[PDB]
Amino acid sequence: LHTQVGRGLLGAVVNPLGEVTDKFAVTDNSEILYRPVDNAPPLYSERAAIEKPFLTGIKVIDSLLTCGEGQRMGIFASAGCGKTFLMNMLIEHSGADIYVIGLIGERGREVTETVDYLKNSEKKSRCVLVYATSDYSSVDRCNAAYIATAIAEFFRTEGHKVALFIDSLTRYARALRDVALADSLPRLLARPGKLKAGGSITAFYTVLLEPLAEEVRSILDGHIYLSRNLAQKGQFPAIDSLKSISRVFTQVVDEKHRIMAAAFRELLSEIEELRTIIDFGEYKPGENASQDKIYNKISVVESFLKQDYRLGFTYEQTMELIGETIR
Known part of the structure; x- marks a missing residue:
């Protein structure tokens, strides 16, 4: 119900109980404060209209699918389409102040590959990683998503340009589905955005393609579609621009x-x-x-x-x- 926030989490790996289990970078700041994980979304009079581009450094995105500061973008791909590798590019070549990554993947060797990459990234001093493996309960797997969002929300209130990654919304939905076995999204996804009096949260949500995709497609402000057939052709990133869109495009370019x-x-x-x-x-x-x-x-x-x-x-x-x- 409450979690750890602050600049002291920069370079830290956070688990579904909110506690530090690893570090991929150590930082001057040790500031650690405490906030509730479920915060209300910004009232529409506090939101600013999306008008500034969130440049990714990726040619296909910045030219034809230009994101905006505060936008939540979907990344639709089936397994093995380089959705994680595209997320690595988005972190390396964008210019956000702080990156917050929320991995609701499940195998154990999953998360350490991400910890390994962040260990060697030039952005390591400003990244926070939240994870939840299959060995954790469905409530804990959910809470990993709320914790990652709450950490990003604190940095936004401080005025930072925050980029949030949730991988995946499918794995999240599976765990959310089991709580029902005994509607956090749109509420989950209404929290990103650009504050008039504060910073911004630009969010990227991964959706595994095999209903769920139909539901979130209407909620987001655009989607990037990774198609397996351009990947087997050797084109990376496998972004099908003609089947992808950023609906704030006209407002940000x-x-x-x-x-x-x-x-x-x-x-x-x-x-x-x-x-x-x-x-x-x-x-x-x-x-x-x-x-x-x-x-x-x-x-x-x-x-x-x-x-x-x-x-x-x-x-x-x-x-x-x-x-x-x-x-």
Whole structure:
């Protein structure tokens, strides 16, 4: 009902009982205070309209799926689509003040791989990890999500630009389902956002694809869809931009970004249709100049979409690259 918060948790690994079990970084600050895990969402007069972009350093996201400070974004993927690796990129290449990660995964070796990565991350001095394995009860697995959110809420009230990761909402829902065996979301997800008098919580929720996805799709402000077929093609991140959206996009980017994003999306749609024309054996070079020009652009847009996970791109570099692609 109450949990540990404060800057003293930076570099610490927190369990479903709120206690420190490990450290991946040690920090000057030892500030540790105490807050209830279930806090009411900001009253609509305290929320600010989402108008500033949360840049991720990832070309596909910052150009076509531009997030906003305070947005909650869904990451939809089936197992083995690199949802954890995409979350690693989001941490490395964004510019948040503090990162709070909530893993409701279940196997034991799960969490330590994340602790291992945070141990070697350049953001380690400003990350907090909350976990809950299968050996914990369903109430504890839930409470891991409330604790991660409460920690992020304290940092937001201090004025920090907070990024929150909940992986996963499915595993969370399974544990939440068993409490019913004896509706925390929307209430769970109404807590992120940007405060008029404070900082922000930009949230990313992972949803395992095999009802639950239909329910949360209408609640969030957008979703990133990781499709297995672009991953087996070798394209990473496996983000299908045409099947993903950030609905605050128009509110967080200017008009030159908007026209370039529209033009790039028309190019993407024309490429996949040309691809199915190729697979059908109906494409002949020199037969249709329009098809041939789109064909000669397939390589340069694949060049833009793919990204090494250790590389980050500034907003200027992303807009410069996309402009030279749609020329």
